[PDB]
Amino acid sequence: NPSNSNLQALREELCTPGLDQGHLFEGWPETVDECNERQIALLTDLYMFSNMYPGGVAQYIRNGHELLARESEEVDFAALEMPPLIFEAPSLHRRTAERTALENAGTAMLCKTVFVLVAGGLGERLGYSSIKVSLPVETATNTTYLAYYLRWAQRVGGKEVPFVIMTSDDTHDRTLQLLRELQLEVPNLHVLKQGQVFCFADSAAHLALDETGKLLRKPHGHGDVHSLIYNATVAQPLVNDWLAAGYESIVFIQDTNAGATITIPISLALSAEHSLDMNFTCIPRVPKEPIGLLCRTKKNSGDPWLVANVEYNVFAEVSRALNKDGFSPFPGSVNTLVFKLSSYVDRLRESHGIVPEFINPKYSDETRRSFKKPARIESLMQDIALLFSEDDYRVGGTVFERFSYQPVKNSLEEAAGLVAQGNGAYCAATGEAAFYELQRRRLKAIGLPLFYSSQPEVTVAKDAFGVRLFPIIVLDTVCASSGSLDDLARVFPTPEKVHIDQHSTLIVEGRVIIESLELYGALTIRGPTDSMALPHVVRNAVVRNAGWSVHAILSLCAGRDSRLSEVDRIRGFVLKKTAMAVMDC
Ligand SMILES: O=c1ccn([C@@H]2O[C@H](COP(=O)(O)OP(=O)(O)OP(=O)(O)O)[C@@H](O)[C@H]2O)c(=O)[nH]1
């Protein structure tokens, strides 16, 4: 593509004061012609960066200088306080008139919602070699996070629901593989792959090389999602297609928080009720939490207030210097972002989806100033809130119960350490446990008589903590529709005649109505896969069998003829699916 002369001009340019990338061409011949294919390739790699980053590599270096100087300084705001527009959501396990109104209002709005899934990470930090959306939400059905989100979206928004997945070099191919393998048919899905950015070996922003001598690359952060969307087409801009088709909201979700399918309808309803352009999904936060705080900020004493997320580390540092006259006052943002689409698009078009950047290098020492590993510039998807002036827009937050926040983000060992400090585990074990409990709390809210012990049923991480799983009740999207309390009530029309023992397992797939049941064991009930077909009705059912059990993965663990996978090891237990009754037709 690019010319021999253009590559020469760029090389020369990069060697000028303020750029100083001479180290990249150490011992090269005078002109491009004389350069070998390998050298020609590196210059090409530098050159093509322009169609990936605003201003290309030259501006990247300049930005690096600015940010590196900036981050060497002390972060501080001239003003910081509670956001004006904070709204408390009613409990998810109480079927009050208010909860009902918000759920049904939000559910209608789901019909005009665009969904965006941010999925550019592996679960390595968890102990998981594959993509995080391939993690199961729970091992009873093994439904992946990916299918979980996609089927819900297609349920509430129909088959042609507009859906974006942002991937990366790490997750992209595998994401496409998973889509194919699960036979997911999503006509209006757009998979947008973020590009990695160059790295700085040092504080002078000298570009880093890898082991082969090629330019080193690292992720630019989830902030890329806005740029990717701004540049996506269907020759018509993606966002224009959405707008013209009548879509009115857009929501952004993380890769392993199943709670989003519960919070979203509520947030949508509240966004409409309080005319919110941007609505941060929040929870009350404990000061000892790697979660950001939603704050009304003012960077300089002359600026306007901005409503935006303030990262935990920053808020810590910020506080000690400028104190001016059991959770944090400010809400904790879980990064489920809800927008009025028209407002989002306006800001998008104005900024080209570019959001403020930062750099956060890891040093070898406090004093030696040397990097431990090459740094790169990053961006956060939530920082788009900075483009929404308080004069033109209403940016606020909705506060939910902490229980509705169920990320799978820590390894078993990390969770052990965390639990000891009295903090949340947020590992695969507690994620799975929380999902089962969530179903139970929702079901009880409509009158299902679920009596079960709160005692843990298995201990993980060398006996560090326990979780319980049973009773296990999982209804698919054809059965439970949107998951609203009203939708659940359709499955259980006369709840008081349904008696699910605390040790039982109930799996429901398809169009099923359960009127009366006594279950002591494991049961799967299957109905029509078509949401519009006549339902399989269960009445006067009695099922007794050995059902399922759970036990910890033993420390002894090693050995051939083994069936333990990473999925098992990252949660520290295994379901034994001993027996299972099936009711079809
Ligand atoms: O460059 C990135 C970084 C993060 N993310 C998205 O970050 C959410 C939170 O990302 P975090 O930054 O909070 O965690 P992480 O990336 O270290 O690990 P993952 O979450 O990727 O597993 C997930 O949606 C993650 O895929 C991206 O999509 N791209």
TrEMBL record:
One Pfam family cited in the UniProt record for this chain: UDPGP
Residues the entry annotates as binding UDP-alpha-D-galactose: V118, G120, G121, Q194, G221, H222, Q254, D255, G292, E311, S333, Q382, K409
Record carries keyword Transferase: yes
Entry binding sites for UTP: V118, G120, K132, Q194, D255
CDD domains: UGGPase (cd06424)
PANTHER family: UDP- GLUCOSE PYROPHOSPHORYLASE (PTHR11952), UDP-SUGAR PYROPHOSPHORYLASE (PTHR11952:SF9)
Keyword Nucleotidyltransferase annotated: yes
Biological source species: Leishmania major
Names of the cofactor(s): Mg(2+); Mn(2+)
Catalyses which reaction(s): a monosaccharide 1-phosphate + UTP + H(+) = a UDP-monosaccharide + diphosphate
Residues the entry annotates as binding UDP-alpha-D-glucose: 118, 120-121, 194, 221-222, 254-255, 292, 311-312, 333, 382, 405, 409
Family of this protein: Belongs to the USP family.
Example of a GO MF term: UTP-monosaccharide-1-phosphate uridylyltransferase activity
Keywords: Nucleotidyltransferase, Transferase
Name the UniProt record assigns to this protein: UTP-monosaccharide-1-phosphate uridylyltransferase
EC number annotated for this UniProt entry: 2.7.7.64
Gene3D superfamilies: 2.160.10.30, Spore Coat Polysaccharide Biosynthesis Protein SpsA, Chain A
